[PDB]
Design a protein around this nucleic acid. Structure first.
Ligand code: MG
Lengths: 346, 211, 210
DNA sequence: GCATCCGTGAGTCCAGG
DNA sequence: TATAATGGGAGCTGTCACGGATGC
């Protein structure tokens, strides 16, 4: 019922590796990687396509799916075709097919063996934005990189090299998802550095630091203004459903207006403006009203150049500019008289 | 063989080899089949009795199982195992929902409705209510399993800058984000061919995110 | 939503639909002639992880060998339930045993050589070859096998039985074979002239087992 | 046939903070 | 990028009462 207890059980199924069993699975993995390289040398097919085919038949038909790097869609038809053209090899070549299969199975068994290291490492990363189980699955991506990159020949135990890629993976996830508004990795590291700096400064000052103390202890290039802006960028969003009162009647969204959709006052004012603009445009002849309705864009939404208004009216650009002048002047006179439009200038 | 050549073991003269004091011993319910010529199945292939293992057709399969081509010992090992299709989760259940022929269940349960015991009548009526709801409706039972989870339009779950410049947001945003992260991580653990246990855990966690 | 609509249609109790949906039990869609505990696999039957892994990948088990103790059973060799796999390991299933990381590799090197012995005709048992352990000769009284070359002694000792090689100057000059029942009287690297005692044979001398 | 466990519901509006 | 590291931690304690689905 409790997902992490269930997953701790599934993990305690696979027993841990003896130094021999670990070195053996490691070695088989390295040699199967080698064998896929050799099988590409032999067949001239793409090493990644080769790897995905060997992997397909290892895991089973339960899982075959299109791979993004692969230039070909990986369905049972084409994996049967390529598995057949692989089985059509000489003994000393088809031997590399058997090698790759064994290497894939060693890979799965070594991963599933070291699945508990991931848990023991991610338990120290909770309360940092991400769920325990989210943290374990990122540690599992770390375990996968580490299996595919491990060199038994260096004589090091597996745990030592895996722990690096596991820590790497968990930290990249924490820095990549824990924020609703996502902030690049380098910037998150800068923010955290600034955190720890201010904490040192306060733990020695007996009080919080100002922007200036932090801009000093942070180093050159950093002025108080920059500390300020970096903080303003780090400011996480807050929930609309965060309550204000003991009762559930009170949310925080219930106080935020909507400044996008216009108010009925606003819309009505635009309507009265449109109508009064029409009323004062009609005192112009339809040519000068039309020249202005084009040169500003109250019709069709866009304003025209003088060449367009003159090639529409069949008149020179000086003449259409001139009847625009006189249209504007007659509108200014009508406005000095009736004063019907002043109230809309705000 | 060994890490560095100067520790390898080479045979100085002709002799047979004997292996004493092994680290541990592994009993496997399997079937052995030696070979001398070219072998025609690789490790990972599943084979039923009557299948061609090695040497052009001479040595063949006795038992139901899965192929382990031991090259050191020059023998094909077939480990007793069926090709059983047993699944987990909503992909399985969506299958079973697709495979439900409704009218045949309507018939089964109408027959059931004649039963003397009041209990079987009650349960077959209850079930028939669902079957006939889906029938009269036009609704495919598998629709109760989501493949494409829809996204509510942004304005009804907003990211709004309040007066102070700070941001308010809705909880549906953090829920959807959880969903996209677990879905993307799943797609990437699939492409990279991750083990079973891990894909199971990602699948479960993804269910709970949709929940 | 009780009573589950999905759980109603497919005749699955809430407990089971949870177990399949939240990944605690497998549900079968095509048994493919699978079997378990003798009963064959019926479609839509619910299987735990142990059960499904058994049917799908095969029962197996590894048992550890304490250090220094060898195997009672051989590699590749079929074993039965209950059969002890080592002086402290008893196997819980049947099938083929397999070795995991042998500690000691013993190579038996074959040697085909030519060696000479001298015996009183009375005691010899004439045969065209001599099987291992087969009697070679029966002597009535202690008889001193004697050197037939001058040289330095290379005394190579087997489990039972011995090889004396005399070598004048590095180059070998004689290879004498001393079978079971004949004690050498010389030490490695000894100098012997012709006719001095190499070995005393008493009673019967038979071929060694090796 | 009875307990037994499950989920679901439990008055209106108004102010603050 | 390489000593080696291999199964988590809370829980939260004083409603009340129904209906309706699930086990001896
Ligand atoms: Mg500074």
């Amino acid at each position: 019922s409790d997902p992490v207890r269930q997953y701790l059980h599934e993990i305690g199924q696979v027993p841990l590796l003896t130094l021999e069993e670990e070195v053996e699975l490691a070695r088989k993995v390295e040699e199967g990687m080698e064998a896929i390289k050799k099988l590409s040398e032999i067949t001239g097919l793409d090493p990644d396509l080769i790897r995905e085919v060997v992997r397909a038949k290892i895991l089973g038909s339960a899982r075959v799916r299109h791979i993004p790097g692969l230039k070909e869609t990986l369905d049972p038809k084409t994996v049967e075709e390529i598995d057949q053209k692989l089985k059509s090899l000489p003994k000393e070549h088809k031997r590399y097919l058997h090698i790759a299969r064994e290497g894939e199975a060693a890979r799965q068994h070594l991963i599933e063996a070291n699945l508990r290291l991931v848990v023991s490492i991610a338990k120290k990363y909770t309360g940092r934005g991400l769920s325990f189980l989210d943290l374990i699955q990122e540690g599992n991506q770390g375990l996968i990189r580490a299996v595919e990159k491990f060199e038994y020949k260096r004589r090091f135990k597996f745990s030592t090299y895996a722990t690096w890629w596991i820590r790497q993976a968990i930290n990249r996830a924490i820095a990549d998802q824990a924020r609703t508004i996502r902030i690049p990795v380098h910037m998150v590291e800068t923010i955290n550095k600034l955190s720890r700096t201010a904490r040192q400064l306060q733990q020695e000052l007996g009080r919080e630091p100002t922007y200036e103390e932090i801009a000093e202890a942070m180093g050159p290039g950093w002025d108080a203004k920059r500390v300020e802006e970096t903080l303003k960028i780090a400011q996480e969003p807050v929930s609309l459903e965060t309550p204000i009162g003991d009762e559930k009647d009170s949310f925080y969204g219930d106080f935020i207006p909507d400044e996008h959709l216009p108010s009925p006052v606003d819309a009505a004012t635009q309507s009265l403006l449109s109508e009064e603009l029409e009323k004062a445009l009609s005192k112009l002849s339809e040519r000068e009203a039309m020249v202005l309705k084009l040169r500003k864009g109250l019709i069709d939404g866009r304003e025209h150049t003088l060449e367009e208004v003159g090639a529409f009216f069949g008149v020179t650009r000086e003449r259409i500019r001139q009847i625009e002048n006189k249209a504007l002047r007659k509108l200014k006179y009508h406005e000095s008289r009736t004063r019907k439009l002043r109230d809309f200038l705000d | 063989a060994a890490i560095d050549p100067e520790e390898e073991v080479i045979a100085e003269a002709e002799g047979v080899v004997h292996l004493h004091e092994p680290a541990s011993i592994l009993v496997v319910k399997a079937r052995v089949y030696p070979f001398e010529d070219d072998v025609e199945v690789s490790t990972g292939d599943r084979v039923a009795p009557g299948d061609v293992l090695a040497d052009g057709g001479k040595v063949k399969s006795d038992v139901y199982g899965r192929v382990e081509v031991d090259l050191v010992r020059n023998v094909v090992r077939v480990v007793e195992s069926y090709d059983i299709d047993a699944r987990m989760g909503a992909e399985a259940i969506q299958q079973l929902l697709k495979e439900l022929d409704l009218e045949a269940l309507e018939k089964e349960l109408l027959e059931e409705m004649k039963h003397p015991s009041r209990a079987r009548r009650a349960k077959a009526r209850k079930r028939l209510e669902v079957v006939r709801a889906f029938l009269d409706s036009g609704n495919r039972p598998e629709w109760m399993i989501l493949e494409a989870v829809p996204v509510l339009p942004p304005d009804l779950r907003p990211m709004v800058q309040v007066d102070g410049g700070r941001f308010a947001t809705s909880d549906l945003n953090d829920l959807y984000r959880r969903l996209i992260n677990r879905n993307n991580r799943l797609k990437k653990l699939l492409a990279q061919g991750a083990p079973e246990i891990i894909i199971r855990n990602e699948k479960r966690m993804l269910q709970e995110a949709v929940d | 939503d009780v009573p589950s609509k999905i759980g109603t249609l497919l005749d699955l109790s809430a407990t089971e639909l949870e177990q399949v949906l939240y990944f605690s039990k497998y549900i079968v869609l095509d048994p493919k002639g699978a079997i378990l505990n003798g009963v064959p696999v019926e479609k839509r039957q619910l299987l735990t992880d142990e059960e499904y892994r058994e049917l799908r990948y095969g029962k197996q088990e590894t048992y550890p060998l304490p250090p220094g103790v060898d195997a009672l059973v051989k590699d590749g060799e079929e074993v039965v339930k209950g059969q002890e796999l080592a002086p402290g390991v008893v196997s819980r299933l049947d099938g083929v045993a397999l070795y995991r990381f042998p500690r000691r590799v013993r190579v038996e090197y074959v040697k085909k050589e030519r060696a000479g012995l001298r015996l009183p005709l009375a005691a010899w048992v004439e045969k065209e070859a001599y099987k291992p352990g087969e009697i070679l000769a029966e002597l009535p009284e202690p008889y001193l096998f004697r050197a037939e070359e001058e040289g330095v002694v290379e005394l190579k000792e087997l489990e039972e039985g011995a090889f004396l090689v005399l070598r004048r100057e590095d180059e070998p000059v004689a290879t004498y074979f001393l079978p079971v029942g004949m004690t050498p009287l010389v030490v490695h690297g000894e100098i012997v002239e012709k006719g001095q005692p190499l070995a005393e044979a008493k009673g019967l001398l038979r071929m060694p087992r090796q």
